[PDB]
Design a protein around this ligand. Sequence first.
Ligand SMILES: COc1cc2cc(OC)c1OCCn1cc(nn1)CCCOC(=O)[C@@H]1CCCCN1C(=O)[C@H]2C1CCCCC1
Length: 128
Amino acid sequence: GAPATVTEQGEDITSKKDRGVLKIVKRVGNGEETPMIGDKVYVHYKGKLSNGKKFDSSHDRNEPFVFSLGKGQVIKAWDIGVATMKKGEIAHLLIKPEYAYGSAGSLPKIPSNATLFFEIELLDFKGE
Ligand SMILES: COc1cc2cc(OC)c1OCCn1cc(nn1)CCCOC(=O)[C@@H]1CCCCN1C(=O)[C@H]2C1CCCCC1
């Protein structure tokens, strides 16, 4: 499935090159600009435990998910991964627990040492 393909073909986008955040561009976006720390970002996404076992979607609320990049308002993997994306891009991320919820997890929703998968569409980003 999509997670296993990311394992297979995904680029390591971590500074430490620890495969903690793996990325595949599924649909190439447009323009050269990728967002800066502080930018307001708008995405659609689907997320799940690599298991399959909890599934979450912005499309379940039929409205974009909005956050400020690089303030830890989202897990580390999003701050890293969304920063790499161009407007219109769809990316798959596969994320080791160190870049998500860690040994602690976020119980009961997310267990200890969970790997996460996301499909993210970067809709827009604007200056703060
Ligand atoms: C850990 O608590 C949640 C995680 C996720 C979804 C949750 O509810 C929809 C959720 O409940 C609390 C409410 N909340 C928080 C956030 N969004 N909603 C953004 C910040 C924390 O989330 C994140 O940083 C990441 C990236 C941005 C989208 C949400 N997300 C998640 O981790 C989802 C996970 C994804 C894996 C399957 C379960 C939900």
